[PDB]
UniProtKB/TrEMBL annotation, chain A:
<dbReference type="Pfam" id="PF03284">
    <property type="entry name" value="PHZA_PHZB"/>
</dbReference>
<feature type="region of interest" description="Disordered">
    <location>
        <begin position="1"/>
        <end position="13"/>
    </location>
</feature>
<protein>
    <submittedName>
        <fullName>Phenazine biosynthesis protein A/B</fullName>
    </submittedName>
</protein>
<dbReference type="InterPro" id="IPR004964">
    <property type="entry name" value="PhzA_PhzB"/>
</dbReference>
<dbReference type="GO" id="GO:0017000">
    <property type="term" value="P:antibiotic biosynthetic process"/>
</dbReference>
<comment type="similarity">
    <text>Belongs to the PhzA/PhzB family.</text>
</comment>
<dbReference type="InterPro" id="IPR032710">
    <property type="entry name" value="NTF2-like_dom_sf"/>
</dbReference>
<keyword id="KW-0045">Antibiotic biosynthesis</keyword>
Length: 158, 157
């Protein structure tokens, strides 16, 4: 049905999608301003870590400081194979994509890092309130020269 | 009210029920979960230590994997299930938790907990591809396997 309430939802979903698209195409020095797409109290970060706890970055200002670190450590990062998923909630989107670039973490040799990622984007008033990324930390270990633990799966059918 | 979109709403509703059934399947019912798939459907784990998926291809293989899984994860339950419809009536995502005993050959019995994203793509009202994404490090912990710690110097507070 074409009601003003359904129309508002569509508008919201369209606006929010544009921001997800912008986020995912943000490269290079533009990364230093990606925080501006967040609410003042917005949270972003990595939900799949070796420690098992997220690295959550809280607040628009913190996100901007994190961007300085990220550009140092991932100096040429690009996201590719981007698929955006709208949901039944006009303020919640998922993205499946890959990423590749140099990895330059102190205490390790410089490497080439590739991973598969899922991102969650939740919105409030047209700005991102919570962004979360999910990847396989094992692929990061490989990029850093870190031995990847191996699980034997005995009897796993063929 | 347009017949195309009526078809889509219907397919999406039907598909949502199958996703719910899958996510609520527990205990011996797990041995019949393969029935929710197309004959050539694929399921499995997309986040592995090896970097390659453990993909199980076909309804019969899927049914075999379930015997294995019931041995290895005898009491597994999904919880905190959130189902996400998408713009494709045939594609859904699920965010959830899962936990249970982990009973692998050659490792001490453990208690395994992880956070999961699942992808479900449909064809003809059955699952053509299921993929699950998790953090393998939590499965290492559960088996007593040492997990390296990545240092991130400079990482701001
Ligand atoms: O920018 C990111 C959040 C901090 C951890 C980083 C990582 O090690 O992948 C990614
Ligand atoms: O996980 C990540 C890979 C490297 C770039 C990071 C970022 O600053 O977004 C995210
Ligand atoms: O049922 C499953 C697919 C094969 C690997 C398993 C695991 O080791 O997590 C999960
Ligand atoms: O990753 C998994 C943990 C144990 C159950 C397996 C399943 O139910 O498919 C999946």
């Amino acid at each position: 049905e074409n009601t003003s309430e359904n129309r508002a939802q569509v508008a919201a979903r369209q606006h929010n999608r544009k921001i997800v698209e912008q986020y995912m195409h943000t490269r290079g020095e533009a990364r230093l301003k990606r925080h501006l797409l967040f609410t003042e109290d917005g949270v972003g970060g990595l939900w799949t870590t070796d420690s098992g706890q997220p690295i959550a970055i809280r607040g628009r200002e913190k996100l901007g400081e994190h961007a300085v670190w990220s550009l140092q450590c991932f100096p040429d990062w690009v996201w590719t194979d981007i698929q955006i998923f709208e949901t039944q909630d006009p303020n919640w989107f998922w993205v499946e994509c890959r990423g590749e670039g140099a990895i330059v973490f102190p205490g390790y040799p410089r490497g080439q890092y590739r991973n598969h990622f899922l991102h969650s984007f939740r919105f409030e008033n047209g700005l991102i309130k919570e962004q979360r990324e999910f990847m396989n930390p094992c692929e990061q270990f490989r990029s850093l020269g870190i031995e990847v633990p191996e699980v034997r799966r005995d009897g796993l059918p063929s």
